[PDB]
Each structure stands twice: as C-alpha cells, then as structure tokens.
C-alpha cells in the first residue's frame, strides 16, 4: 500500500504563462484532497520546483527549490498548507521574477533522487516522481543509463504542451507519459 510521491513542477515562463502551473496546482489539490483516509496515514508527499529563480535544497544546487519537504501523514491540513505554499509562489512570481532562460531540470531530478534515497533508505515503499512540464527536449542528459541503474523510482511524466525525456522514461521501469488533456475527464 505505502507510497511516496515526489512532485516536480516546471516553473519556466511558458509553464507560468499558459496556466500550466495553475492547472498543475489545481490537479494536485484535487488529487491530495481525494486520498483515502487509510492512504493518508501511510503515504508521503514532497514537491520541488525546477527552472526556478529560487535556489534552496539539500545539495545547495542553483535553481532547484524544495518548496515542500517530505511530508507524512498526508492530512487535509497538511494538504491545504502545501497548496498554499504553491499559491504564494505563484502570486509572488506571476510578474516574471528572473526565470527566463533557466534549465535545471536534470539537476532537480538528481537532487530529488538523492533526497529520496536519503529519506527512505531501506524501506519497503513504492517511490514515485511525478513531473509537470511542457518541454521534453530540455533534459540535459549515455548518462541516462547511469540513472537506469541508480534510480529505483519510477517516473510519471506529465506533458503540458498541447527525446531525452522519452528515452529516460523507457529506461526506468513502470514509467509513463500522460497529457494534461487526459488526467481527468472533461464533461461533455
């Protein structure tokens, strides 16, 4: 049952201009609030922002922001708080605060892999990384094969745009790619 989901949200200008960050937040809120009670008591969440002007994380890497540390239990209170943190970030950065031309997706991915591996150690827990981005070509990464050996975390990529990422996906087991258009069912 137990599971760990780490969210990575791309906050590049195209993500921030086309409401993809907004949409991602809305979706995270729906999903987290919709967890079963049993589930909240066994699972973990965390959130990292990639391509981000804020640099704060365990490895003190540029342009990666661990906006939510590993969190359990995933209670309603905890969820509302997490979503508020994402909301502040948007409100505070909706007026374009120096995120042009940033590429830190691979560094973010590696920080997460290191944070995860430290976090969980020898625990029997499903580990997962969910990635919200509209650029599957921006993943500065043969290298893939090193991850394919190191990462025991499956990767769910969410393409928010109407390759390196594809390669990495097929490399790691149980990985997948979805459109935003197929996350929930629109009613018509």
């Amino acid at each position: 049952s137990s599971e760990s989901t780490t969210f990575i949200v791309d906050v590049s200008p195209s993500m921030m201009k086309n409401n993809n960050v907004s949409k991602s937040m809305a979706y995270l809120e729906y999903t987290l609030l919709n967890k079963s009670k049993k589930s909240r008591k066994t699972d973990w969440i965390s959130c990292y922002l990639a391509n981000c002007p804020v640099s704060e994380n365990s490895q003190e890497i540029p342009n990666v922001f661990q906006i939510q540390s590993f969190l359990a239990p995933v209670t309603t209170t905890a969820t509302i708080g997490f979503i508020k943190r994402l909301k502040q970030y948007c409100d505070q950065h909706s007026h374009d605060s120096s995120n042009e031309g940033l590429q830190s997706m691979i560094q973010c991915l590696l920080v997460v892999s290191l944070d995860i591996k430290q976090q969980f150690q020898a625990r029997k827990i499903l580990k997962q990384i969910v990635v919200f981005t509209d650029n599957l070509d921006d993943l500065d990464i043969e290298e893939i094969d090193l991850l394919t050996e190191e990462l025991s975390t499956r990767i769910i990529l969410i393409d928010c745009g109407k390759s390196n990422w594809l390669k990495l996906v097929e490399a790691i087991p149980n990985s997948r790619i979805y459109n935003m258009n197929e996350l929930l069912v629109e009613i018509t």
Binding site: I61, L110, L114, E143, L146, E150
Partner: peptide, 12 residues
C-alpha cells in the same frame, strides 16, 4: 549515493 552525487557536481 556516490555515483549520483558526482553526476550532479558534473552538472554544476
């Protein structure tokens, strides 16, 4: 642990 860390220093 070690491989990941050098691979990240490589990227910084």
């Amino acid at each position: 642990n070690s491989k990941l860390l050098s691979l990240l220093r490589s990227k910084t």
